[PDB]
Design an enzyme around this catalytic site. Structure first.
Site, PDB file in Angstrom:
ATOM      1  N   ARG A   1      12.331   5.559  11.855  1.00  0.00           N
ATOM      2  CA  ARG A   1      11.096   6.206  12.637  1.00  0.00           C
ATOM      3  C   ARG A   1      10.683   6.151  13.985  1.00  0.00           C
ATOM      4  NH1 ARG A   1       8.716   5.180   6.628  1.00  0.00           N
ATOM      5  NH2 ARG A   1       7.303   7.196   7.403  1.00  0.00           N
TER       6      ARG A   1
ATOM      7  N   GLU B   1      13.108  -9.393   1.806  1.00  0.00           N
ATOM      8  CA  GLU B   1      11.933  -8.310   2.206  1.00  0.00           C
ATOM      9  C   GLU B   1      12.970  -6.516   1.905  1.00  0.00           C
ATOM     10  OE1 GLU B   1      10.819  -8.422   5.702  1.00  0.00           O
ATOM     11  OE2 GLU B   1       9.566  -6.185   5.998  1.00  0.00           O
TER      12      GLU B   1
ATOM     13  N   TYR C   1       9.422  12.949  -1.066  1.00  0.00           N
ATOM     14  CA  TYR C   1       9.748  11.307  -2.288  1.00  0.00           C
ATOM     15  C   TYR C   1      10.904  11.758  -3.084  1.00  0.00           C
ATOM     16  CZ  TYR C   1       4.954  10.702  -0.398  1.00  0.00           C
ATOM     17  OH  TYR C   1       3.873   9.497   0.306  1.00  0.00           O
TER      18      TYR C   1
ATOM     19  N   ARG D   1       3.584  13.955  -4.150  1.00  0.00           N
ATOM     20  CA  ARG D   1       3.723  14.840  -4.330  1.00  0.00           C
ATOM     21  C   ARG D   1       5.046  15.867  -4.624  1.00  0.00           C
ATOM     22  NH1 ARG D   1       4.248  16.713   1.363  1.00  0.00           N
ATOM     23  NH2 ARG D   1       4.408  15.087   1.942  1.00  0.00           N
TER      24      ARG D   1
ATOM     25  N   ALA E   1       3.296  -0.760   4.698  1.00  0.00           N
ATOM     26  CA  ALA E   1       2.994  -0.684   6.075  1.00  0.00           C
ATOM     27  C   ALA E   1       2.327  -1.993   6.286  1.00  0.00           C
ATOM     28  CB  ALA E   1       1.433   0.114   6.093  1.00  0.00           C
TER      29      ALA E   1
ATOM     30  N   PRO F   1       1.072  -0.905  -0.311  1.00  0.00           N
ATOM     31  CA  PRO F   1       0.219  -0.253  -0.191  1.00  0.00           C
ATOM     32  C   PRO F   1       0.474   1.259  -0.173  1.00  0.00           C
ATOM     33  CG  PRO F   1      -0.828  -1.876   2.309  1.00  0.00           C
ATOM     34  CD  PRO F   1       0.407  -2.144   0.780  1.00  0.00           C
ATOM     35  N   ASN F   2       0.012   2.204  -0.769  1.00  0.00           N
ATOM     36  CA  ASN F   2       0.437   3.895  -1.052  1.00  0.00           C
ATOM     37  C   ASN F   2       1.826   3.706  -1.232  1.00  0.00           C
ATOM     38  OD1 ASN F   2      -0.895   4.865   1.523  1.00  0.00           O
ATOM     39  ND2 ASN F   2       0.257   3.635   3.359  1.00  0.00           N
TER      40      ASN F   2
ATOM     41  N   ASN G   1       7.928  -5.373  -1.313  1.00  0.00           N
ATOM     42  CA  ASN G   1       8.198  -4.240  -0.124  1.00  0.00           C
ATOM     43  C   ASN G   1       6.479  -4.072   0.567  1.00  0.00           C
ATOM     44  OD1 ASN G   1       9.019  -0.844  -0.836  1.00  0.00           O
ATOM     45  ND2 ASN G   1       8.208  -1.714   0.852  1.00  0.00           N
TER      46      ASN G   1
ATOM     47  N   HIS H   1      12.395  -2.340   2.339  1.00  0.00           N
ATOM     48  CA  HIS H   1      12.097  -0.993   1.884  1.00  0.00           C
ATOM     49  C   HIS H   1      12.860   0.378   1.986  1.00  0.00           C
ATOM     50  CE1 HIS H   1       8.629  -3.069   4.748  1.00  0.00           C
ATOM     51  NE2 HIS H   1      10.505  -3.317   5.171  1.00  0.00           N
TER      52      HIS H   1
END
Lengths: 145, 145, 145, 145, 145, 145, 145, 145, 145, 145, 145, 145
Positions: E108, E99, E23, E18, E78, E10-11, E75, E101
């Site tokens: 974070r 995996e 990004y 933007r 979330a 997602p996302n 990836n 990211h």
């Protein structure tokens, strides 16, 4: 050339310097002769090592693999609670070990209950003073045959 | 003298030492040469360093600042879980770093999930064996001129 | 001979390796001289020691017992969070100590709130920069006399 | 007062019952005879007791107070992790004890790391099989003499 | 058919949307094209899939088993922190995975430190932006060829 | 009033209301006069305040803002562990502060290790008795230039 | 061929209390009879046992091994949350078991969510009343032949 | 129509694909047909539903209310550990349910011990394979009458 | 009359031993007679029971329901911290109870702060020695007469 | 000589303010007169105090050391869970105390299980209503001769 | 539009079932109409969206960015406790949001106290029924001018 | 009808002491006047109260029951995290309340996430500045017709 290696961690060199009250006069050297003698009686060769430097102990464990050390008796002292490097050293060389502590660790601060070694030792002896080393050696001898 | 410094932590010197298929055949030395060759192809100078002593690694990081090292690729191995001193060395000299582990650290004991370095690395690679160092270097090369 | 001992932990040698960018322009050497001067004004001998190696600091603490050091002022830096070997060294020699930190620890990461030394120190000073060492000395002097 | 009591906790009666190994052959009865023989060879009287019932074991340590008993060697087995009643029995009669476990308790489930007895024992031996009892006895023998 | 499958959680569709600074300019489609090309250069077929719907991704992973996909680069974004369904999809089809990211997840919030996938992946790459995919793919190619 | 304010929390009025060792000679007023003198010696005005009532202390911190107090030295005593209201008062008025404790908080019960102020203080002094206040003041004087 | 043994833990003898609904009319003996009948219907012998004494149950489980019991259906009741001795009994005799609870254990106090057996049972049935024992038996029958 | 609804969560569609070794030859479709048959034999209508999408299952539960479903038998699979939405759906429609798992969830990773549904289910069956569904159905039948 | 049962848990039979200076003047038998006398003085019958065996105490609580015992005064001792069985015995028979401890249980080790009984007791008395039983009885008398 | 001071914490003045239905009708004043009377009959003077202000209660405890109060009976109410200042007041004056609560604190919310006073009280009485104060007075009377 | 988007999470479509007890009479459509009308009175355009599917909501939040939605009022319902995807959607599109819950979330199970959205909302309204939405809208209108 | 009482906790008196924005301008008075005006427009009488003293607020809540206040709107500020006494006041008077916070409490430190009031409030509003109070009053008016 040496069949069993005994490793003493940091601060154990202070044994017998403190007083006539806190410990008596038993020193690290006294423990070592007693341990050498006991091995000699059983026709086993026995080396010993002490340092206050983690890396020196790690190096020494690596050297033990090249020397064909069959079993390690280690008192890691404070390092049991803190050193994963010491753990990965013993595991990396694949030399079985017995963990020894002079004092009863479970009877002191909570942080002393955690060990980075115990779950991978053959076994552990806490709280029996210097005799703990001796008991570990007796077991090791029984197992070397 | 060296634009990129590769640091190997404790026990990585054991790579390839139990040769017939425990760890496999690849040595630390082999990894180093591969990396030096990769850097030379991209006209970048590359130094390496390995020690089982935390203080030696800390000293090296400090020396890296005085040498103008631009980026560090570090496999702290066990020290990732234990050494805030290593963290504070890297932060104190302000050299960006990439953390590399050969094995998948998240697939082993729970204490290996915690790192004193990861939250301050540019990034992290775990579980891809020696190729992890090579990817980090590739990344480091593109980040630099 | 040397009477009060000041110990600086890892990374404190980096003090002043910079403009105003982690700190200002004050160096470990500057701090030391101020301290030697302050002790000299009170007719007290004062030695100092710094290292990035845990074992070197442990050895120094053992040497301190032999030389009859009466009080240690220690900034263990990162080691406060990680070294039970350091704790056991201070306890094993039975020299009282005051813990000092330049920065406020409680104002940084959560893992910096934990200390293997604080609970056994006479007291602790954090966040007052170099003056922390001076205050500790002042206290140490009045405790001796 | 110069008698020693060995207490085996629940499930230790099952030793040796599943033919060959892993950990076959050796039985509770074998262990008892070995220990009786060892105590006879030093001119010390030794009783033993196994039960699967917490209350029987608690009763038995109350009996031990009223009779000679100078030291208890106890393998509480599962009860180590669960019985504060066993803890208050040993503390209430004020007979010192040594905790023994055949297997390395730290090498198995996390709930086995907790002990209601360990912090009060003279000491503890885990992971050395039946020799652990023998070592506890040897220690006990040179604690009366 | 498919051979290597790249899954974006997602996302990730928002990449490069933007447009100013945050990004970058790089889009999900750009990343896909780069990866498809890299695979073509090595004579490997490579498919890609993004969705904001957990069930769509799960369905896709099932489909990948029937298509004989050899390795997944995922990836999960979330979903790493929340989806055991995803974990059980990958395990249930028994296709090894890497995996990836973009950002350094360990830098974070604390809830991002936890993964329901990491412990079962071959390995993990975090914080190297899009190059992480490319590195994962390079590792994947060598594992097959 | 104005320039520097010293705040004493609950139960500090009891100082030197027990003569023997479970307090000693030194009263709260003695401390206050020492500090006033020390401030006068540096041409700084120094007010002081004690109360057993959280609200009284809060009201005084608000008053301090009106009065243009430049720095607060506060020994919150028990309130360090409990009062977020005290934290918000100090933060709300924006007067920097130094936390002081007579005893070594870290050497006592685990609930005394938590502070609702420490992380916002300039710094903290614990375990140096009354001299802790003097050191804080000395620091406060040098900083107001 | 085959014995199934049904073990009822402490307080299950109290089944049939304020009879017209606090709990229902149904008694332990009723449950036993239905189960005995069910088993007879499938040419399987079935014993039952209840006690309020942990040791009795443990003894029973040892006897079962010697009797060649093939499967145990156990409702340990309160003992599921407390008895590692019960765990070790079942594991020591190596008789597979099915755990049964009359009431939904997850729907009550949080301390009832923990079991020292569940992870080693074939499976678990909670909340289905007495039918749970019947379902377990039905499963045990199919599994034996 | 006395309707019972059987809900299968994510990944249960995979049943009977990884055929000979890891898990067996039985399919979801097989399970469904045995259950339909078991319901027909008792004159109860029975629908079934599987999806890998949380929202589809949630929608289905809502439809069930409008259809007058009396009781739900749900195997939420992975969703039991993660979906409060699924919990609130069941609660919001007020249809009692029985929770079923094929495998023994307590025998796997610690995160599988937590459920957002168990505390609100009539009861739970884990580890009895497909017979768990049949047992739940048998119970459901007797309850509805 | 209106029968009241006093239950004493494990180790309370250790009564008084080495009286001067092990806070043990009066026996369990002395407490019992005192209580019997207090109950006779109010025309209430009172039985007492002590055992070191959990199952004996559970059995006695079941017998108490059949004897129409109106209220239990229980000093579970160690059992308070460990026995849900005991909790369920008291709740299953529905006899209200008062928990009593001789010593201040909150002043000892942290595991003694947890009770499986307290939350279901009418009330609790700790620290008041034997008087605590007498106060419970007094309360129990007023509640029935 | 022997004043005994009863302290009532916040909200206890509300006793008797929604009288029915035979739950909360006796006032704080009733309890006080009842205690005063009990004390006069034993020739002991007894003062009482209630506030909703933590500081007022702390001032009273200090005044009590000046007045030669021999023992405090305190129902801190809500303050037992929150006020280390109260703890330190009672410890700072060295007046022994008994903690009393009307309701069974252990039967309510989990945050009520924690006390900052209990570990330092002589003992504690929870859940016996106003009769808990009386029992504390009776114990206090017998303790002063 | 000059838009405000209102998002309703899973199970909010059920508003309206069982008029008297569990649920008052308000429906999701009623709420919507009441919000549209309020926005129209202020000359603001308002859209609404409900789904039981996380991915649908995520897609809708991405669509809102393309549409130039200025502020989101979201009642994520169960997803507040579970969906980091939802959190990253709102952050990734950088549309400020207000979180609303009909019921008092803090008055229910402990797991409902945790939110993956709250810390990033402008604010939060819980427990005020449908008016919570209206209050959020009123705030949102005043913010846009 | 009768009175609504608005309670402001500690430090809220400091509102408006720093422009343009550390949330300057708006004062507690301004807020109070706004709320008074709003209540006067709906023919409701509204009182307000602010203190930095927990006991003053508690007293005001008791002297609110007596004056037949129907609903309390409380911003406890810091006390929400610390004061069980404040909780037991609002509950003891049985006056319903709404909890309000100006700032988003969930965006700040983790200790601010915990509340001793929230779970007993009708509802809660955080992060909407002073409009939160208005919204609460609007709700209170409709409730108290």
């Amino acid at each position: 050339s040496s069949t069993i290696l005994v490793i003493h961690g940091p601060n154990l060199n202070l044994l017998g310097k403190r007083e006539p009250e806190v410990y008596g006069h038993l020193t690290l050297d006294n423990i070592n002769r007693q341990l050498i003698a006991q091995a000699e009686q059983a026709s086993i060769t026995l080396d010993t090592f002490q340092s206050n430097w983690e890396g020196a102990i790690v190096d020494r464990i690596h050297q033990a693999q090249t020397e064909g050390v069959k079993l390690i008796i280690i008192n890691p002292a404070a390092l049991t609670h803190t050193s994963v490097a010491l753990r990965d050293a013993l595991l990396g060389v694949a030399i079985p070990f017995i963990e020894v502590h002079l004092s009863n660790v479970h009877a002191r601060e909570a942080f002393r209950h955690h060990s980075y070694l115990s779950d991978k030792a053959i076994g552990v002896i806490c709280g029996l003073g210097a005799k703990g080393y001796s008991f570990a050696l007796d077991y090791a001898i029984e197992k070397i045959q």
